Amino acid sequence: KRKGIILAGGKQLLPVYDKPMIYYPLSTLMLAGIREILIISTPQDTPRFQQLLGDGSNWGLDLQYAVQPSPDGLAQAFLIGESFIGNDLSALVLGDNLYYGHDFHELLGSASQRQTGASVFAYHVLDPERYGVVEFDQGGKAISLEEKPLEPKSNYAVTGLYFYDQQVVDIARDLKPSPRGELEITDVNRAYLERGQLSVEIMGRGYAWLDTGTHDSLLEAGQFIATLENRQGLKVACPEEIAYRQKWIDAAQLEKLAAPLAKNGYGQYLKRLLTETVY
Amino acid sequence: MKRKGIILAGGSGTRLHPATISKQLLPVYDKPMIYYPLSTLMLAGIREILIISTPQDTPRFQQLLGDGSNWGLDLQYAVQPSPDGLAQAFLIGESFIGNDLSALVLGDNLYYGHDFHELLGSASQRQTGASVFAYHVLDPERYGVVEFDQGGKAISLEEKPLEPKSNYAVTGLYFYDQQVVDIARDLKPSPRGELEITDVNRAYLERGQLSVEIMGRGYAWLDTGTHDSLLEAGQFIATLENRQGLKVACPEEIAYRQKWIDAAQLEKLAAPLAGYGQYLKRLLTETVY
Amino acid sequence: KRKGIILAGGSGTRLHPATLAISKQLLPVYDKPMIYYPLSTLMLAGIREILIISTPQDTPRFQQLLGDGSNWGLDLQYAVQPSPDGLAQAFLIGESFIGNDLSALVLGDNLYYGHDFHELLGSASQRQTGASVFAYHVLDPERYGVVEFDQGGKAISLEEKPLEPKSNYAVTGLYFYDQQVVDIARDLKPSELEITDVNRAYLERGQLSVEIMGRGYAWLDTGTHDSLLEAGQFIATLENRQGLKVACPEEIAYRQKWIDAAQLEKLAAPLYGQYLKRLLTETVY
Amino acid sequence: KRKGIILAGSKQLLPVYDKPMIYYPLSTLMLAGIREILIISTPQDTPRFQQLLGDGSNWGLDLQYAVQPSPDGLAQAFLIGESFIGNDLSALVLGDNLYYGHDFHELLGSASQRQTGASVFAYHVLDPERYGVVEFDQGGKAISLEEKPLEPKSNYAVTGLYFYDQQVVDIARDLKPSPRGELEITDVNRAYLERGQLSVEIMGRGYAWLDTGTHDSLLEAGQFIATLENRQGLKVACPEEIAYRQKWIDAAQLEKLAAPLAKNGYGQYLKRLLTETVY
Ligand SMILES: CN(c1c(NCCCCN)n(Cc2ccc(Br)cc2)c(=O)[nH]c1=O)S(=O)(=O)c1ccccc1
Ligand SMILES: CN(c1c(NCCCCN)n(Cc2ccc(Br)cc2)c(=O)[nH]c1=O)S(=O)(=O)c1ccccc1
Ligand SMILES: CN(c1c(NCCCCN)n(Cc2ccc(Br)cc2)c(=O)[nH]c1=O)S(=O)(=O)c1ccccc1
Ligand SMILES: CN(c1c(NCCCCN)n(Cc2ccc(Br)cc2)c(=O)[nH]c1=O)S(=O)(=O)c1ccccc1
Ligand SMILES: [Br-]
Ligand SMILES: [Cl-]
Ligand SMILES: [Cl-]
Ligand SMILES: [Cl-]
Ligand SMILES: [Cl-]
Ligand SMILES: [Cl-]
Ligand SMILES: [Cl-]
Ligand SMILES: [Cl-]
Ligand SMILES: [Cl-]
Ligand SMILES: [Cl-]
Ligand SMILES: [Cl-]
Ligand SMILES: [Cl-]
Ligand SMILES: [Cl-]
Ligand SMILES: [Cl-]
Ligand SMILES: [Cl-]
């Protein structure tokens, strides 16, 4: 079994065009076939996520909630989430990451099916210095990770989507804090790399990986999603749809979810899914 | 005679669900939507403001804005139990208005342009009657619509007409004398079952006490009430601010330029925020004409 | 061998006055002419021999921009569509150009983006017989050729711009054909000489492959002021995020090995140019 | 009373949303009441402007064309345009410039009515180092101009709209190339400043002055104009409209222009001008 964690650090309640930002990472985990999900946020925001999503049983999900008292690093998700993870495999997604593209279901599926080691994704960006950066040898094997380097060794940033085996809790517990006293995800990923158990999969230029964490980037992500949805008459990262297509809820349950929203474009969309075949 | 302000940040029901943080708490680029109508009232020289919203949203506005004393304002809060029309602001706000002149602004309206201070100033200085603004739009049937005679005098108002008599919509910014509370009290619900601001404005028109000022095409009046319109407004503000290195509708700036807060107060506001905090600090050091 | 045709048809006065200055398919989508997108699409399919068909007025302007294409390892030719009497007319105008070869037709104002696009074109291109088209879920199918599917997902009807669409699956402006298409086009009667009638002829012989182009691909129309602006913002967002260009023909020629490092360096020097130089030094997976 | 020059150093043929870029500076000169306009461009581009605009008699204009053989600086417009200007006052519209705002007609009118000296506009920008920069004293009087300073003395850039008396040709003739080896408009403006004949008017933050000279800025200008026009049902910088409202063309001339465009939003708009009162 693989359990999911969304870290919504100290924003993920803001809309990207037509739905809350958190619908995107939630939909990402759901596409990977993960239905048991811990949402970690600030003391102030955790209750607001609870109020919005509840226990998730309406979407065939099992949602739980935990607080990050202070932003002491992303790897703190594994300590906060230790009892939630138990003895299971896990996946970690960041709250302000948006993914789009063809074969994304297959790309997540393959990473998810690995019973041992860790899987991350490398994506060519203009500004790699803002992220974890992967260095490759001539043969395309990952040989180094650097967190926000002044002099990036490549243009390949590690995305905010991480797949882990049962070692991650123990690796997180044994992490030496950074000079700033923070538990860094890059140190978790380097631990797997040093054991020869880090799979770095290329996320090709044919995929969109967008940040939604600045005023400018949120606006650009909004326009991007609006253009796709208005062209297609299909929604990106509609959790009700992904639950339906995963068979976690049936036609009758989707109809019940649509009814209260029926006066607006979202409820009308959910109803139309019942009457058309989408390939 | 003092003029008090009302922002009606009404419920949109389930219209913007599931995206809706309430509508007027959503950002237009870099600041909450409510900063725009708040900045509008402040530019008109209004410091005493009632914010009317849903029971669920009222606490979130209070948490964001507080009593407004940090910005030289006196902010109060009231609830609209149900969205039974915009003219209900004058009943909810009756004791707040008391014997004073008033201004009403809608929560999802954005204004921009040169002479906007002068345009508000002139409307605000009228001690009697009411002032509204007429703006040429593509879809007037969505608004209150003004009909003009050959001489350019307003002769009719219609709320959301099937057959608009012009392309001039009344904007969500209204200036009133002490008659508005009494006019609002006598209003009966419209065919749509609402207490309509257009009925308030028609009452002033019939007494020959409605000033309809043209808001020229050189001004931007933007609606932020749909997913699409909010996105367009965001890009519009982003383009202006990134070009100018100046912010549109930064309340701290307007308070400072009105001399409602001094350099020392602005510095105290800037420190905890130190792009927004950096912007507030630059206001202290730069001459902007 | 498979030869390519780009039909950059007249839009009449539809986009005037913006298109009084520059033809529709010469208008930029963010950072490059519209025609770079369909050209790059044919190049990604491995097609090097391409006929560009346009109006009498616009054909010379395409020639002035692109020349014979030898700079990009291409063989570009030009022909005129006297009047916009239908898309199937490309096969009559292009008859002697096509000769005895397989063909592909792309429309001038169609933009494609997505992962596996090289593989999707590759598979369609490798079919030596019949025709291949792509079906894409759209909001407004009534604007396009519309595919009807049976319960088993087999294509059973095509209708051009139906009042009552039988699905939300539009046929995209990208078509792969065997040696039958010229003969089918010759026998077509006006409805315009419609590409949907060509595709239905292949369907009736059981030789039409309708591949689903999934929602994970972007198929954008650039034929209105609004749609061109949206396409511009879409490409700008991808390119500024990635530090990579969409549909840069020099890059696709280089990665296809149609031009070498020395040829790319010669193209970069007079110039976009900084981007071409970076291609020489960086491994992009 | 005043002749116009558009220096188009091609960029100015590209559309800003729904019309060629050059419609914007042309509409600007027309709003100032200028009907006699010289378009200066490269040998290659001058014919393309001629093909688009012709002699301008359709819009009640008198359009002429001249070539800049080599890009030796924007002040060369006054040498190339010397015989065109003759003994008249002039206005120059330079760069890839878009203007919008309330009182713009009045702002141009006032600058235009000055019978002596020169008038320029100063606008607060984020990146003044890209432009001519105005320094002000404590009393707000202009005291220095610098072309693209490394250390700008203010955030006030001089816009690409210049009003000149009959001295400009003689000042241009006496100019020597700058360190960058160009005849610079800033040197023309400084000559007027030194003789106490430069009026620097503030263009307030309530006006939009947009650059359309990069891929990014052209896209942003497109979205800006699209937002205004689709909101208002009114067009920005439609030359036919400005000619009609200036009474340079009559209803019969406007009808002839509108009919061939009538199946699109532009011709429908020109027809609406015949029947509708817009204040
Ligand atoms: C745009 N995509 C997207 C979808 N396509 C995936 C195509 C299936 C493989 N042929 N499906 C269909 C879908 C089909 C089967 C199943 Br089981 C689940 C979902 C949706 O329901 N919602 C989507 O939003 S996505 O890029 O993969 C994605 C998804 C989620 C967040 C972010 C991005
Ligand atoms: C963009 N404008 C705008 C400003 N300009 C006003 C023009 C100067 C008068 N000559 N000032 C300066 C300003 C100067 C003096 C005083 Br007292 C108050 C404010 C700001 O501080 N913030 C602004 O945001 S605005 O269109 O009028 C507007 C304003 C508010 C909401 C919406 C729209
Ligand atoms: C965005 N893509 C895109 C690319 N990706 C394709 C990735 C295949 C990797 N296995 N390549 C790389 C590329 C790699 C190998 C070869 Br041989 C040719 C080109 C480019 O050079 N330019 C591109 O622009 S695209 O969607 O396929 C496309 C392409 C053309 C027009 C429109 C859209
Ligand atoms: C948006 N404006 C704009 C207009 N407003 C001016 C309002 C004056 C009210 N007293 N008029 C009306 C107009 C009215 C009377 C006469 Br005579 C000429 C033109 C237009 O016809 N076209 C416009 O496009 S503008 O900012 O000045 C401008 C103008 C040009 C380029 C860029 C920007
Ligand atoms: Br990492
Ligand atoms: Cl986050
Ligand atoms: Cl790819
Ligand atoms: Cl289905
Ligand atoms: Cl009204
Ligand atoms: Cl105006
Ligand atoms: Cl045509
Ligand atoms: Cl086309
Ligand atoms: Cl569509
Ligand atoms: Cl078809
Ligand atoms: Cl897909
Ligand atoms: Cl200057
Ligand atoms: Cl101003
Ligand atoms: Cl550029
Ligand atoms: Cl149009």
Author numbering:
A (entry chain A): 2 to 11, 25 to 293
B (entry chain B): 1 to 20, 23 to 276, 279 to 293
C (entry chain D): 2 to 192, 196 to 275, 280 to 293
D (entry chain C): 2 to 10, 24 to 293
Q: How is this structure described in the published paper?
A:
Based on the initial success with 1b being a sub-micromolar inhibitor of P. aeruginosa RmlA, it was decided to extend the length of the linker unit from n-propyl in 1b to n-butyl in 1d and n-pentyl in 1e in an attempt to position the terminus of the C6-aminoalkyl chain outside the allosteric pocket. In the case of 1d and 1e, a primary amine was incorporated at the end of the chain. The increased length of the linker chain in analogues 1d and 1e compared to 1b led to around a 2.5-fold increase in potency with 1d and 1e having IC50 values of 0.303 ± 0.026 μM and 0.316 ± 0.023 μM respectively (entries 4 and 5 vs. entry 2). One highlight from this structural study is the demonstration that for inhibitors 1d and 1f the terminus of the newly incorporated linker unit sits outside the allosteric binding pocket. This provides a real opportunity, in future work, to attach a siderophore to the end of the linker unit with the goal of potentially increasing the bacterial cell wall permeability of this class of inhibitors through the ability of the siderophore to be sequestered by the bacterium.
RmlA, a glucose-1-phosphate thymidylyltransferase, is the first enzyme in the pathway and catalyses the condensation of Glu-1-P with deoxythymidine triphosphate (dTTP) to give dTDP-d-glucose. In addition to the active site where catalysis of this reaction occurs, RmlA has an allosteric site that is important for its function. As a consequence of its structure, the active sites cluster at the dimer-dimer interface and the allosteric (or regulatory) sites cluster at the monomer–monomer interface within each dimer.
